[PDB]
Amino acid sequence: LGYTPINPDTSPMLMYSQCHWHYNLPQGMERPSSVNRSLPAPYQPHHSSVNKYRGVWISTEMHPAFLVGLAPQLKKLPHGRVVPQTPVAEVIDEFNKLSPLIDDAAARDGWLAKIFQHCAFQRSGAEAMALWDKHCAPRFMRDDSASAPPLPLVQAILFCCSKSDSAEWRPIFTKCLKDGWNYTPSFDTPQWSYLLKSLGRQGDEEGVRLVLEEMADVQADLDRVEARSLVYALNAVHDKAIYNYVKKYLFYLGERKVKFLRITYADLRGHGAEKLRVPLKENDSMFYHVCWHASIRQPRQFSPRQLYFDYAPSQL
């Protein structure tokens, strides 16, 4: 009987009142609580996956015999989860000279694939991009040739052209939609993560138009795309038309991701901008709309003294 409340889990006068059991009654189980097994919830943690690979995978496709033979000439490239630091010139030299020896169109691709992973991790996509010009784009992309690239090739090169900003993603990527080889869905969520930020780094608001349109079109994890990425693909947008498209776009992102977007965007811009290797173009209109859009999808906590401070009691 005071300010200190009664602990309802330890008080007899409560627990042994009439509004609960008495200690005399048969004291059996009242009602079985089947909660977790009738309507179960899925596991969406806040602490990111500790052991997730956190990167694109290049997925060698060479014949087993080649792997044994190609072992040293491949080992300067990033192995499974481990990447040495050889200079890219030391690699591309090694490929071009050894390319004719490999009688396989497929093996050389996987060979060339790891080089993309190598150059991309070394940010030296510019030189390996020329290898796409000499080797890949002619036999595969040129004029709808019958030879369709094995998946790792575009899987790799799309990282290559993305990690180091190079506008050569648009030609290949457009050949990956429904019209081309249709390799769009098999992408992992990290693929679109580096992809969007590269655009945001570049500023291709019209590329944001294309790739984002495919995201919902493909039914990818549009929530699990890392926030540092989406901040870029939004911030590059300044024109009117795409600005309309993005407002329609956010209603695809789950409220939880949306609540953290206005948290990361307000961070990469103002408070902890030091994280960003690239200084963001500062678009205020896109900035405000997001902070407003997030405070809409979220529940609206009722603060009375704010809304009705000057409200006039109309006595007439």
Partner: peptide, 14 residues
């Protein structure tokens, strides 16, 4: 707060 985005170009889908 409505409208948020301009809906679409006026059309005749039929």
């Amino acid at each position: 707060y409505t409208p948020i985005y301009a809906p679409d170009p006026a059309t005749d889908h039929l």
